[PDB]
């Protein structure tokens, strides 16, 4: 007998998919919409390399720890790779104030350029560029490159005027010298107590030393409290101090990439590659909507889901 039939394809595909009704239904074609592969590298984001601090911390680098003289001169970065146990941090012992906000503020910047803020040689009745064995450079007592330790004022005020004539903010770092006792306070700054006042228009901050013997470290019972600030565009900072001020000599003009920074804690080094999405485990080169590589991500990334696979059926039910 003559006989015509209607039917559909079946092949040798072992792909199975799950549906709301049945599980592990064999199909002739299935698509994976979950990205599960990365390149195992720390890359540049869209061509912009991250900031590699190497043996230094952000603080050590910005302050200008002599051992950080080799980094160097990075103009822009898409994110920062943090080296946790970086040895080159604060060479002179002390506290860093508000480090976390500085981290956020520096997480992604554009036109980063160092600037000389004032000329110490213009100053009179004072000693400038003071050094210490604790901040050595090649077997000699040095100090932070971007800071200036001022002494010998004999209890008299000295003044520093800082100006930001650009349309970008100006990053400033400085310190307050916490003397160990009155005898050191008098010998260095010629008084028993000092004030240091930062003037941003009508706004002002006053700094006072916290005098007292700290437990000895690096032959120092005294400390330095390190501060940072941001002098806005077209603005002026005026400083007056009767001592204890480690002056800001070098600052940095910078433009921060709005809502486009990043802080990366990773053991991987930095490679010569680029990506639009980065994880601590490596970069994702994906056009897929979902990924299960890592939740902590930077850039334009697929959404992180708690799944091992997302098999989307395309083909037919494969039952011969």
């Amino acid at each position: 007998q003559d006989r015509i039939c209607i039917g559909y394809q079946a092949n040798q595909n072992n792909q199975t998919v799950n549906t709301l009704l049945e599980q592990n239904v064999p199909v002739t074609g299935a698509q994976e919409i979950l990205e599960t592969n990365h390149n195992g590298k720390l890359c540049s984001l869209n061509g912009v390399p991250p900031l590699d601090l190497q043996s230094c911390t952000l603080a050590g680098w910005l302050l200008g720890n002599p051992n950080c003289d080799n980094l160097l001169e990075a103009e822009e970065w898409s994110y920062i790779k943090i080296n946790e146990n970086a040895p080159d941090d604060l060479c002179f012992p002390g506290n860093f104030e508000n480090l976390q906000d500085l981290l956020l503020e520096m997480s992604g910047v554009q036109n980063f350029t160092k600037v000389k803020l004032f000329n110490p040689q213009s100053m009179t009745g004072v000693t400038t560029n003071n050094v210490d064995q604790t901040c050595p450079f090649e077997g000699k007592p040095s100090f932070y490159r971007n800071l200036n330790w001022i002494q010998g004022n004999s209890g008299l005020p000295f003044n520093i005027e800082i100006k930001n004539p650009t349309s970008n903010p100006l990053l400033l770092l400085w310190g307050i010298h916490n003397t160990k006792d009155a005898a050191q306070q008098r010998n260095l700054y010629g008084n028993d107590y000092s004030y240091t006042i930062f003037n941003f228009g009508e706004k002002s901050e006053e700094f006072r030393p916290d005098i007292g013997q700290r437990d000895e470290i690096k032959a120092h019972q005294d400390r330095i409290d390190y501060y940072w600030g941001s002098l806005p565009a077209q603005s002026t900072l005026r400083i007056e101090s009767t001592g204890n001020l480690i002056a800001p000599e070098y600052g940095f003009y910078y433009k921060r990439k709005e809502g486009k920074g990043g802080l990366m804690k990773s053991k991987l080094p930095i490679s010569d590659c680029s990506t639009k999405c980065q994880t601590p485990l490596g970069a994702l080169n994906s056009t897929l909507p979902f990924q299960n590589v890592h939740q902590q991500t930077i850039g334009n990334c697929p959404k992180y889901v708690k799944a091992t696979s997302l098999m989307l059926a395309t083909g037919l039910r494969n039952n011969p």
Binding site: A10, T19, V305
Partner: protein
């Protein structure tokens, strides 16, 4: 209805006729291409419609920010639960619909042929038509093509079905 055909390749849905010439399979390429275009467009939709913000994840911190860290970690899990649950169900639903979509395509291919040979065939009840007449490679073809002429085989079919019963 009994299952798919191993060795029906070159098309998703199609025909497998069987006359006095011989046997063989064939693919309905237009009906296949429609389905192939659509399923592709579904997959593209699920992929391309995802537009992502530039996101920056921070979870490295300390102990002097414990309130913000707690909220940040709470937001992370909540985002995790949403995207996990929703995507899982998106896949399950769409896999069920995709399979329903296939069954409908061959079934309309079936009903389009059945509509061409009304009386001129017996429905075997398994996607196969027992033709009540002789059908060569011009007849089986025109059925596939959508041009089968029901009248050019009417009387011969009636004779055959009469030979399937009595008479008075």
């Amino acid at each position: 209805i009994e299952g798919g055909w191993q060795g029906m390749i070159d098309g998703w849905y199609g025909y497998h006729h069987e006359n006095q010439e011989g046997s063989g399979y064939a693919a309905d390429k237009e009906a296949t291409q429609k389905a192939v275009d659509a399923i592709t467009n579904k997959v593209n939709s699920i992929i391309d419609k995802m537009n992502s913000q530039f996101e920056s994840n921070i979870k490295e911190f300390n102990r002097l920010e414990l309130r913000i860290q707690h909220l940040s970690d709470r937001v992370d899990d909540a985002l995790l639960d949403i995207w996990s649950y929703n995507t899982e169900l998106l896949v399950l639903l769409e896999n069920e619909r995709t399979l329903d979509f296939h069954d409908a395509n061959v079934k309309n291919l079936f009903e389009k042929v059945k509509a061409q040979l009304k009386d001129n065939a017996i429905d075997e009840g398994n996607g196969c038509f027992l033709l009540l007449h002789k059908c060569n490679n011009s007849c089986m073809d025109d059925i596939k093509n959508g041009t089968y002429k029901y009248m050019d085989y009417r009387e011969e079919s009636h004779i055959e079905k009469q030979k399937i019963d009595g008479v008075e």
